[PDB]
Amino acid sequence: KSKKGKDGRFVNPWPTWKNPSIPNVLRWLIMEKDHSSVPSSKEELDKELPVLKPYFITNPEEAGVREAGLRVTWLGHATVMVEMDELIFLTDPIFSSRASPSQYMGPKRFRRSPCTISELPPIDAVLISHNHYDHLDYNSVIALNERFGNELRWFVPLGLLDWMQKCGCENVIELDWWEENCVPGHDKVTFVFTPSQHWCKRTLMDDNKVLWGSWSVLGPWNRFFFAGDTGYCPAFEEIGKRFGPFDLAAIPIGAYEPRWFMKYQHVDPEEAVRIHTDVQTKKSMAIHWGTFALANEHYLEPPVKLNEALERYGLNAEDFFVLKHGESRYLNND
Amino acid sequence: SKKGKDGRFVNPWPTWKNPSIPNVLRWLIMEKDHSSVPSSKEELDKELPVLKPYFITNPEEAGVREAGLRVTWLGHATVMVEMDELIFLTDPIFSSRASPSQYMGPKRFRRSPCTISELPPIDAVLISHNHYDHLDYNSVIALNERFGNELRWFVPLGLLDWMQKCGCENVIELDWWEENCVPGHDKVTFVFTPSQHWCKRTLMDDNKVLWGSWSVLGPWNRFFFAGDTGYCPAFEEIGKRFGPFDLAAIPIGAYEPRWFMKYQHVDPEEAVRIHTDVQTKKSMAIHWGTFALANEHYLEPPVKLNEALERYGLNAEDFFVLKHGESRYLNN
Ligand SMILES: C[C@H](CCC(=O)O)[C@H]1CC[C@H]2[C@@H]3CC[C@@H]4C[C@H](O)CC[C@]4(C)[C@H]3C[C@H](O)[C@]12C
Ligand SMILES: C[C@H](CCC(=O)O)[C@H]1CC[C@H]2[C@@H]3CC[C@@H]4C[C@H](O)CC[C@]4(C)[C@H]3C[C@H](O)[C@]12C
Ligand SMILES: C[C@H](CCC(=O)O)[C@H]1CC[C@H]2[C@@H]3CC[C@@H]4C[C@H](O)CC[C@]4(C)[C@H]3C[C@H](O)[C@]12C
Ligand SMILES: C[C@H](CCC(=O)O)[C@H]1CC[C@H]2[C@@H]3CC[C@@H]4C[C@H](O)CC[C@]4(C)[C@H]3C[C@H](O)[C@]12C
Ligand SMILES: C[C@H](CCC(=O)O)[C@H]1CC[C@H]2[C@@H]3CC[C@@H]4C[C@H](O)CC[C@]4(C)[C@H]3C[C@H](O)[C@]12C
Ligand SMILES: C[C@H](CCC(=O)O)[C@H]1CC[C@H]2[C@@H]3CC[C@@H]4C[C@H](O)CC[C@]4(C)[C@H]3C[C@H](O)[C@]12C
Ligand SMILES: C[C@H](CCC(=O)O)[C@H]1CC[C@H]2[C@@H]3CC[C@@H]4C[C@H](O)CC[C@]4(C)[C@H]3C[C@H](O)[C@]12C
Ligand SMILES: C[C@H](CCC(=O)O)[C@H]1CC[C@H]2[C@@H]3CC[C@@H]4C[C@H](O)CC[C@]4(C)[C@H]3C[C@H](O)[C@]12C
Ligand SMILES: C[C@H](CCC(=O)O)[C@H]1CC[C@H]2[C@@H]3CC[C@@H]4C[C@H](O)CC[C@]4(C)[C@H]3C[C@H](O)[C@]12C
Ligand SMILES: C[C@H](CCC(=O)O)[C@H]1CC[C@H]2[C@@H]3CC[C@@H]4C[C@H](O)CC[C@]4(C)[C@H]3C[C@H](O)[C@]12C
Ligand SMILES: NS(=O)(=O)c1cc2c(cc1Cl)NCNS2(=O)=O
Ligand SMILES: [Zn+2]
Ligand SMILES: [Zn+2]
Ligand SMILES: [Zn+2]
Ligand SMILES: [Zn+2]
């Protein structure tokens, strides 16, 4: 084909090829995080947002997929564990309490992680959407690579290969817009890096030196889409048309407040439903939200707005569902 | 009268104890090693199992409120003693890493048995010294957030600022041989007692704040918490002024290489020495098993403790090691 928007590299770094982006960010200190949600007592946090014990804790067996369907588990924020086509892979693993380079400041999760690395079953690959601290957790990478090793294939955007080896990972793969690879054992599955409308930053002056994006996993049996972080852009229609119908898609539905400031980097539930429609997935799972306070919206608002948008497009909760922390879901195909 | 009183060199706080040594070169390049190698997930589960504390499934219990004394080991020096109508915590560390950084520093191989949220009402907390394996900023902020003025923080001299800067008001700075009480249940007395250790958190803050140990003298039972110390006098002094105590929490880990650690960290034998000097009936054994701050094998300290136990004409009941998260009730 050819009608695919490629990068997307200005003078030296990467801009979003997409027209909706505007260049102006003033970073995370506490300015619009504050407490505009006031997550109250951890008990209320429980009552409203209970943390479940994942299945693989009480029954570490049954953690295959036995081909056929597709199993998914939400481990908070953008951490998703997908079992499909004889393969278990993790996405944006964050297990630390705080998503920050310091121990003294930064957004600290109000919901504990459902499980620990030691407790999670054998991981065959990890997918990294972009490099932000709420998706790339140094300590989580350290734990993953200590437990596993060369056993773990890491799929990262351009610019993160160095960082990965710097951490101590040897099975690391840098991928660009519309670029693919697989796991050495399982070649029938293809992992494709697909565009997105977001940004990268971890330190001073490294802004967009690393790429952002989304992931499309094409196995023979099931197809899976993982958006990562994005505001609405026309790449999602492109992806949907190139990788056919998907069985699951993980779409962010949180951190969309100060829309005047975030719309260029963060969809809201309404644009999240549109994404679900654009990518042609049969089902979608609400990621982001509920775990960290990265914006101004009420911590329970994003599911309500998701249901309101789902009623906007003539859809039901079946099509686009929100899980509990640690809850799983099985989906068999035709 | 008597009692090894506090001291103050020209600049900092000294030990005033005859056993002494310098070169506190921190642990980043000097002995950064794990010649103990905790590994093999299965081996950890079996050798050092982490237990589910009672106040998780049955928080209502909250023990004591009677005459006896219950204790729970939450790793390293974070232990929860419920005694004489008072549930106090000591050296609380619940984070994974004991370091000012997020990228380097000693990271625990055993998770905390419970979390701050799961913790029962803590009336008081005791801080031995300022080291990262005993003073954990994140743990402090969590306690001061869940509780507040309801939490009395007993800290050594020099830590008032650090505490208030974190946001604590119910804070009491104490030099050793000094004391204080509780607003409601004041008949229990908390006394800061001597020790042989060091204080340092940053560059040039060496010995700017005091170290020591704690003695809780309640109406029914008496409890001793050593913290971190090498063998020195004043434990006999402690055992004299106060005592006999009922339970004592004595460190048994972080002792090798001896030549460098002996002056600043007891060994299991020296811990049995403490058990005799402080005149306790029983002892629980803290430090060890949670972080690797020295070169000894992670399972060695219990074995060496039991060796010292027999040699000194004692038995395992007298000085016991709990599991991670285990509790113990004492009706003496
Ligand atoms: C507000 C203080 C300094 C106060 C002063 O002296 O005026 C300044 C100085 C250092 C500044 C930080 C430097 C790193 C980051 C640079 C980003 O481009 C904006 C966010 C951060 C996290 C900044 C936030 C804030 O702008 C800080 C913390
Ligand atoms: C060393 C003290 C902690 C002392 C203590 O806990 O008592 C800590 C507390 C706050 C920490 C600073 C926070 C802001 C900065 C963040 C950067 O990512 C690294 C450099 C800085 C300047 C940090 C340096 C250092 O890590 C500090 C100063
Ligand atoms: C921890 C030291 C001071 C310790 C001392 O001298 O006692 C202090 C002094 C300067 C402090 C920084 C000043 C600029 C910023 C002010 C913000 O409001 C909080 C973050 C920053 C980045 C501060 C981080 C940290 O609070 C520092 C590095
Ligand atoms: C210095 C320590 C380890 C030193 C030791 O204890 O032996 C090393 C080990 C891994 C290193 C990190 C690897 C990933 C990152 C690579 C970047 O290009 C710079 C920052 C980071 C976050 C590095 C920071 C630092 O350089 C670390 C944490
Ligand atoms: C000052 C030393 C050494 C100077 C040199 O190597 O020339 C340099 C070397 C590498 C530098 C760090 C590398 C990682 C980060 C790169 C950012 O873009 C700015 C902040 C950080 C955290 C840097 C801060 C600091 O400036 C360091 C530690
Ligand atoms: C070894 C490197 C520098 C390499 C070189 O020699 O060029 C040096 C630079 C700064 C040094 C650190 C400074 C603070 C501490 C001083 C102590 O007395 C030993 C441990 C610490 C934590 C030191 C460890 C080590 O000695 C470091 C990290
Ligand atoms: C992370 C930056 C820069 C990495 C890069 O930009 O390539 C590197 C450059 C200088 C590095 C430091 C040099 C001195 C020390 C060396 C030790 O072995 C580990 C701790 C220290 C304190 C190092 C920590 C960290 O690894 C730093 C700060
Ligand atoms: C800012 C990067 C992390 C970047 C990332 O995660 O990608 C981190 C990685 C290693 C960190 C350094 C480790 C050694 C020092 C610890 C001190 O307590 C604060 C100053 C130093 C020099 C730290 C400064 C800063 O906090 C660094 C350079
Ligand atoms: C800079 C942040 C708070 C910034 C904010 O409110 O956003 C403050 C909040 C609590 C502060 C800490 C309180 C305890 C310590 C006080 C010391 O004298 C300097 C180091 C420490 C460890 C402080 C470092 C730093 O100054 C912190 C972490
Ligand atoms: C850069 C400022 C200067 C501003 C001032 O005058 O306060 C200085 C002054 C206070 C300094 C801090 C004092 C406490 C610590 C002293 C250590 O030896 C290095 C790390 C710390 C955490 C220091 C970091 C940094 O070196 C600061 C923040
Ligand atoms: N080492 S880690 O990032 O996996 C981790 C971090 C923290 C925990 C637990 C774990 Cl397993 N608990 C307390 N908060 S923390 O220090 O971020
Ligand atoms: Zn992001
Ligand atoms: Zn994000
Ligand atoms: Zn110590
Ligand atoms: Zn210690």
JSON list of N, CA and C in Angstrom, two decimals, chain B residues 44-91:
[
{"chain": "B", "resi": 44, "resn": "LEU", "atom": "N", "xyz": [13.06, -18.31, 47.85]},
{"chain": "B", "resi": 44, "resn": "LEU", "atom": "CA", "xyz": [12.59, -17.22, 48.70]},
{"chain": "B", "resi": 44, "resn": "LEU", "atom": "C", "xyz": [11.26, -17.56, 49.36]},
{"chain": "B", "resi": 45, "resn": "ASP", "atom": "N", "xyz": [10.27, -18.01, 48.56]},
{"chain": "B", "resi": 45, "resn": "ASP", "atom": "CA", "xyz": [8.98, -18.38, 49.13]},
{"chain": "B", "resi": 45, "resn": "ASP", "atom": "C", "xyz": [9.12, -19.37, 50.28]},
{"chain": "B", "resi": 46, "resn": "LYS", "atom": "N", "xyz": [10.03, -20.34, 50.14]},
{"chain": "B", "resi": 46, "resn": "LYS", "atom": "CA", "xyz": [10.18, -21.37, 51.16]},
{"chain": "B", "resi": 46, "resn": "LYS", "atom": "C", "xyz": [11.03, -20.90, 52.34]},
{"chain": "B", "resi": 47, "resn": "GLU", "atom": "N", "xyz": [12.23, -20.41, 52.06]},
{"chain": "B", "resi": 47, "resn": "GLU", "atom": "CA", "xyz": [13.18, -20.02, 53.10]},
{"chain": "B", "resi": 47, "resn": "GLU", "atom": "C", "xyz": [12.64, -18.86, 53.94]},
{"chain": "B", "resi": 48, "resn": "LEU", "atom": "N", "xyz": [12.22, -17.78, 53.28]},
{"chain": "B", "resi": 48, "resn": "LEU", "atom": "CA", "xyz": [11.76, -16.56, 53.94]},
{"chain": "B", "resi": 48, "resn": "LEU", "atom": "C", "xyz": [10.34, -16.28, 53.48]},
{"chain": "B", "resi": 49, "resn": "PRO", "atom": "N", "xyz": [9.35, -16.97, 54.03]},
{"chain": "B", "resi": 49, "resn": "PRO", "atom": "CA", "xyz": [7.98, -16.75, 53.59]},
{"chain": "B", "resi": 49, "resn": "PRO", "atom": "C", "xyz": [7.42, -15.48, 54.21]},
{"chain": "B", "resi": 50, "resn": "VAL", "atom": "N", "xyz": [6.63, -14.76, 53.43]},
{"chain": "B", "resi": 50, "resn": "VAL", "atom": "CA", "xyz": [5.95, -13.55, 53.89]},
{"chain": "B", "resi": 50, "resn": "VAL", "atom": "C", "xyz": [4.54, -13.93, 54.33]},
{"chain": "B", "resi": 51, "resn": "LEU", "atom": "N", "xyz": [4.23, -13.69, 55.60]},
{"chain": "B", "resi": 51, "resn": "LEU", "atom": "CA", "xyz": [2.90, -14.00, 56.12]},
{"chain": "B", "resi": 51, "resn": "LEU", "atom": "C", "xyz": [1.97, -12.80, 56.04]},
{"chain": "B", "resi": 52, "resn": "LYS", "atom": "N", "xyz": [0.69, -13.13, 56.00]},
{"chain": "B", "resi": 52, "resn": "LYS", "atom": "CA", "xyz": [-0.51, -12.32, 55.95]},
{"chain": "B", "resi": 52, "resn": "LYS", "atom": "C", "xyz": [-0.85, -11.89, 57.38]},
{"chain": "B", "resi": 53, "resn": "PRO", "atom": "N", "xyz": [-0.62, -10.64, 57.77]},
{"chain": "B", "resi": 53, "resn": "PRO", "atom": "CA", "xyz": [-0.88, -10.27, 59.17]},
{"chain": "B", "resi": 53, "resn": "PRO", "atom": "C", "xyz": [-2.36, -10.39, 59.55]},
{"chain": "B", "resi": 54, "resn": "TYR", "atom": "N", "xyz": [-2.58, -10.62, 60.85]},
{"chain": "B", "resi": 54, "resn": "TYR", "atom": "CA", "xyz": [-3.93, -10.88, 61.35]},
{"chain": "B", "resi": 54, "resn": "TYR", "atom": "C", "xyz": [-4.85, -9.69, 61.13]},
{"chain": "B", "resi": 55, "resn": "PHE", "atom": "N", "xyz": [-4.36, -8.48, 61.34]},
{"chain": "B", "resi": 55, "resn": "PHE", "atom": "CA", "xyz": [-5.24, -7.32, 61.26]},
{"chain": "B", "resi": 55, "resn": "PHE", "atom": "C", "xyz": [-5.74, -7.07, 59.84]},
{"chain": "B", "resi": 56, "resn": "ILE", "atom": "N", "xyz": [-5.42, -7.97, 58.91]},
{"chain": "B", "resi": 56, "resn": "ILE", "atom": "CA", "xyz": [-5.94, -7.88, 57.55]},
{"chain": "B", "resi": 56, "resn": "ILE", "atom": "C", "xyz": [-7.27, -8.60, 57.43]},
{"chain": "B", "resi": 57, "resn": "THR", "atom": "N", "xyz": [-7.32, -9.86, 57.85]},
{"chain": "B", "resi": 57, "resn": "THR", "atom": "CA", "xyz": [-8.57, -10.61, 57.80]},
{"chain": "B", "resi": 57, "resn": "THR", "atom": "C", "xyz": [-9.43, -10.34, 59.03]},
{"chain": "B", "resi": 58, "resn": "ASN", "atom": "N", "xyz": [-8.81, -10.06, 60.18]},
{"chain": "B", "resi": 58, "resn": "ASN", "atom": "CA", "xyz": [-9.53, -9.79, 61.42]},
{"chain": "B", "resi": 58, "resn": "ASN", "atom": "C", "xyz": [-8.98, -8.51, 62.06]},
{"chain": "B", "resi": 59, "resn": "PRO", "atom": "N", "xyz": [-9.17, -7.36, 61.40]},
{"chain": "B", "resi": 59, "resn": "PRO", "atom": "CA", "xyz": [-8.68, -6.10, 62.00]},
{"chain": "B", "resi": 59, "resn": "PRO", "atom": "C", "xyz": [-9.28, -5.82, 63.36]},
{"chain": "B", "resi": 60, "resn": "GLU", "atom": "N", "xyz": [-10.49, -6.32, 63.62]},
{"chain": "B", "resi": 60, "resn": "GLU", "atom": "CA", "xyz": [-11.19, -6.04, 64.87]},
{"chain": "B", "resi": 60, "resn": "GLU", "atom": "C", "xyz": [-10.40, -6.48, 66.09]},
{"chain": "B", "resi": 61, "resn": "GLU", "atom": "N", "xyz": [-9.63, -7.58, 65.98]},
{"chain": "B", "resi": 61, "resn": "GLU", "atom": "CA", "xyz": [-8.87, -8.11, 67.10]},
{"chain": "B", "resi": 61, "resn": "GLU", "atom": "C", "xyz": [-8.10, -7.01, 67.80]},
{"chain": "B", "resi": 62, "resn": "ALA", "atom": "N", "xyz": [-7.14, -6.41, 67.09]},
{"chain": "B", "resi": 62, "resn": "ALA", "atom": "CA", "xyz": [-6.30, -5.32, 67.59]},
{"chain": "B", "resi": 62, "resn": "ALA", "atom": "C", "xyz": [-5.70, -5.61, 68.97]},
{"chain": "B", "resi": 63, "resn": "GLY", "atom": "N", "xyz": [-5.66, -6.90, 69.34]},
{"chain": "B", "resi": 63, "resn": "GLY", "atom": "CA", "xyz": [-5.04, -7.40, 70.59]},
{"chain": "B", "resi": 63, "resn": "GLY", "atom": "C", "xyz": [-4.82, -6.51, 71.80]},
{"chain": "B", "resi": 64, "resn": "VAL", "atom": "N", "xyz": [-3.87, -6.90, 72.65]},
{"chain": "B", "resi": 64, "resn": "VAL", "atom": "CA", "xyz": [-3.56, -6.17, 73.92]},
{"chain": "B", "resi": 64, "resn": "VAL", "atom": "C", "xyz": [-4.83, -5.52, 74.49]},
{"chain": "B", "resi": 65, "resn": "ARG", "atom": "N", "xyz": [-4.78, -4.24, 74.86]},
{"chain": "B", "resi": 65, "resn": "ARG", "atom": "CA", "xyz": [-5.94, -3.61, 75.55]},
{"chain": "B", "resi": 65, "resn": "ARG", "atom": "C", "xyz": [-6.13, -4.36, 76.86]},
{"chain": "B", "resi": 66, "resn": "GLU", "atom": "N", "xyz": [-5.20, -5.25, 77.19]},
{"chain": "B", "resi": 66, "resn": "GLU", "atom": "CA", "xyz": [-5.32, -6.09, 78.41]},
{"chain": "B", "resi": 66, "resn": "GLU", "atom": "C", "xyz": [-4.07, -5.92, 79.29]},
{"chain": "B", "resi": 67, "resn": "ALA", "atom": "N", "xyz": [-3.30, -6.99, 79.48]},
{"chain": "B", "resi": 67, "resn": "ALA", "atom": "CA", "xyz": [-2.09, -6.95, 80.32]},
{"chain": "B", "resi": 67, "resn": "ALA", "atom": "C", "xyz": [-0.90, -7.52, 79.54]},
{"chain": "B", "resi": 68, "resn": "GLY", "atom": "N", "xyz": [-1.17, -8.42, 78.59]},
{"chain": "B", "resi": 68, "resn": "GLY", "atom": "CA", "xyz": [-0.09, -9.06, 77.81]},
{"chain": "B", "resi": 68, "resn": "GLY", "atom": "C", "xyz": [0.52, -8.13, 76.78]},
{"chain": "B", "resi": 69, "resn": "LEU", "atom": "N", "xyz": [1.25, -8.70, 75.81]},
{"chain": "B", "resi": 69, "resn": "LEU", "atom": "CA", "xyz": [1.93, -7.87, 74.78]},
{"chain": "B", "resi": 69, "resn": "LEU", "atom": "C", "xyz": [1.99, -8.66, 73.47]},
{"chain": "B", "resi": 70, "resn": "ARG", "atom": "N", "xyz": [1.48, -8.07, 72.39]},
{"chain": "B", "resi": 70, "resn": "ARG", "atom": "CA", "xyz": [1.57, -8.72, 71.08]},
{"chain": "B", "resi": 70, "resn": "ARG", "atom": "C", "xyz": [2.48, -7.91, 70.18]},
{"chain": "B", "resi": 71, "resn": "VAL", "atom": "N", "xyz": [3.23, -8.60, 69.33]},
{"chain": "B", "resi": 71, "resn": "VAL", "atom": "CA", "xyz": [4.16, -7.96, 68.40]},
{"chain": "B", "resi": 71, "resn": "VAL", "atom": "C", "xyz": [3.96, -8.56, 67.02]},
{"chain": "B", "resi": 72, "resn": "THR", "atom": "N", "xyz": [4.28, -7.77, 66.01]},
{"chain": "B", "resi": 72, "resn": "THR", "atom": "CA", "xyz": [4.23, -8.25, 64.63]},
{"chain": "B", "resi": 72, "resn": "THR", "atom": "C", "xyz": [5.45, -7.73, 63.90]},
{"chain": "B", "resi": 73, "resn": "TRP", "atom": "N", "xyz": [6.15, -8.63, 63.20]},
{"chain": "B", "resi": 73, "resn": "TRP", "atom": "CA", "xyz": [7.32, -8.25, 62.41]},
{"chain": "B", "resi": 73, "resn": "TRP", "atom": "C", "xyz": [6.89, -7.92, 60.99]},
{"chain": "B", "resi": 74, "resn": "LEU", "atom": "N", "xyz": [7.12, -6.68, 60.58]},
{"chain": "B", "resi": 74, "resn": "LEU", "atom": "CA", "xyz": [6.79, -6.23, 59.23]},
{"chain": "B", "resi": 74, "resn": "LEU", "atom": "C", "xyz": [8.04, -6.02, 58.38]},
{"chain": "B", "resi": 75, "resn": "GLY", "atom": "N", "xyz": [9.14, -6.71, 58.72]},
{"chain": "B", "resi": 75, "resn": "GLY", "atom": "CA", "xyz": [10.37, -6.59, 57.98]},
{"chain": "B", "resi": 75, "resn": "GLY", "atom": "C", "xyz": [11.37, -5.66, 58.66]},
{"chain": "B", "resi": 76, "resn": "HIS", "atom": "N", "xyz": [12.65, -5.88, 58.36]},
{"chain": "B", "resi": 76, "resn": "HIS", "atom": "CA", "xyz": [13.74, -5.03, 58.93]},
{"chain": "B", "resi": 76, "resn": "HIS", "atom": "C", "xyz": [13.41, -4.58, 60.35]},
{"chain": "B", "resi": 77, "resn": "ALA", "atom": "N", "xyz": [13.29, -3.27, 60.57]},
{"chain": "B", "resi": 77, "resn": "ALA", "atom": "CA", "xyz": [13.04, -2.74, 61.93]},
{"chain": "B", "resi": 77, "resn": "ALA", "atom": "C", "xyz": [11.60, -2.23, 62.04]},
{"chain": "B", "resi": 78, "resn": "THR", "atom": "N", "xyz": [10.82, -2.33, 60.95]},
{"chain": "B", "resi": 78, "resn": "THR", "atom": "CA", "xyz": [9.38, -1.94, 61.03]},
{"chain": "B", "resi": 78, "resn": "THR", "atom": "C", "xyz": [8.62, -3.03, 61.78]},
{"chain": "B", "resi": 79, "resn": "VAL", "atom": "N", "xyz": [8.43, -2.86, 63.09]},
{"chain": "B", "resi": 79, "resn": "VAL", "atom": "CA", "xyz": [7.68, -3.85, 63.91]},
{"chain": "B", "resi": 79, "resn": "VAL", "atom": "C", "xyz": [6.53, -3.13, 64.62]},
{"chain": "B", "resi": 80, "resn": "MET", "atom": "N", "xyz": [5.40, -3.82, 64.82]},
{"chain": "B", "resi": 80, "resn": "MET", "atom": "CA", "xyz": [4.24, -3.19, 65.43]},
{"chain": "B", "resi": 80, "resn": "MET", "atom": "C", "xyz": [3.99, -3.86, 66.76]},
{"chain": "B", "resi": 81, "resn": "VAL", "atom": "N", "xyz": [4.12, -3.09, 67.83]},
{"chain": "B", "resi": 81, "resn": "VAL", "atom": "CA", "xyz": [3.98, -3.62, 69.17]},
{"chain": "B", "resi": 81, "resn": "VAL", "atom": "C", "xyz": [2.69, -3.07, 69.69]},
{"chain": "B", "resi": 82, "resn": "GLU", "atom": "N", "xyz": [1.83, -3.96, 70.08]},
{"chain": "B", "resi": 82, "resn": "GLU", "atom": "CA", "xyz": [0.60, -3.60, 70.73]},
{"chain": "B", "resi": 82, "resn": "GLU", "atom": "C", "xyz": [0.78, -3.95, 72.19]},
{"chain": "B", "resi": 83, "resn": "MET", "atom": "N", "xyz": [0.71, -2.93, 73.05]},
{"chain": "B", "resi": 83, "resn": "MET", "atom": "CA", "xyz": [0.97, -3.03, 74.47]},
{"chain": "B", "resi": 83, "resn": "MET", "atom": "C", "xyz": [0.29, -1.91, 75.25]},
{"chain": "B", "resi": 84, "resn": "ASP", "atom": "N", "xyz": [-0.12, -2.25, 76.47]},
{"chain": "B", "resi": 84, "resn": "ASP", "atom": "CA", "xyz": [-0.66, -1.36, 77.50]},
{"chain": "B", "resi": 84, "resn": "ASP", "atom": "C", "xyz": [-1.56, -0.26, 76.93]},
{"chain": "B", "resi": 85, "resn": "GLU", "atom": "N", "xyz": [-2.59, -0.69, 76.20]},
{"chain": "B", "resi": 85, "resn": "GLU", "atom": "CA", "xyz": [-3.53, 0.27, 75.57]},
{"chain": "B", "resi": 85, "resn": "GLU", "atom": "C", "xyz": [-2.75, 1.24, 74.67]},
{"chain": "B", "resi": 86, "resn": "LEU", "atom": "N", "xyz": [-1.91, 0.70, 73.78]},
{"chain": "B", "resi": 86, "resn": "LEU", "atom": "CA", "xyz": [-1.13, 1.56, 72.84]},
{"chain": "B", "resi": 86, "resn": "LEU", "atom": "C", "xyz": [-0.56, 0.70, 71.72]},
{"chain": "B", "resi": 87, "resn": "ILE", "atom": "N", "xyz": [-0.85, 1.05, 70.46]},
{"chain": "B", "resi": 87, "resn": "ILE", "atom": "CA", "xyz": [-0.29, 0.31, 69.30]},
{"chain": "B", "resi": 87, "resn": "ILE", "atom": "C", "xyz": [0.75, 1.20, 68.62]},
{"chain": "B", "resi": 88, "resn": "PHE", "atom": "N", "xyz": [2.04, 0.94, 68.86]},
{"chain": "B", "resi": 88, "resn": "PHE", "atom": "CA", "xyz": [3.09, 1.76, 68.29]},
{"chain": "B", "resi": 88, "resn": "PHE", "atom": "C", "xyz": [3.91, 0.99, 67.26]},
{"chain": "B", "resi": 89, "resn": "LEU", "atom": "N", "xyz": [4.36, 1.72, 66.25]},
{"chain": "B", "resi": 89, "resn": "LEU", "atom": "CA", "xyz": [5.19, 1.21, 65.18]},
{"chain": "B", "resi": 89, "resn": "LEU", "atom": "C", "xyz": [6.62, 1.71, 65.36]},
{"chain": "B", "resi": 90, "resn": "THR", "atom": "N", "xyz": [7.58, 0.94, 64.86]},
{"chain": "B", "resi": 90, "resn": "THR", "atom": "CA", "xyz": [8.97, 1.37, 64.96]},
{"chain": "B", "resi": 90, "resn": "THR", "atom": "C", "xyz": [9.66, 1.29, 63.61]},
{"chain": "B", "resi": 91, "resn": "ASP", "atom": "N", "xyz": [10.54, 2.25, 63.34]},
{"chain": "B", "resi": 91, "resn": "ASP", "atom": "CA", "xyz": [11.33, 2.35, 62.11]},
{"chain": "B", "resi": 91, "resn": "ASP", "atom": "C", "xyz": [10.52, 1.92, 60.89]}
]
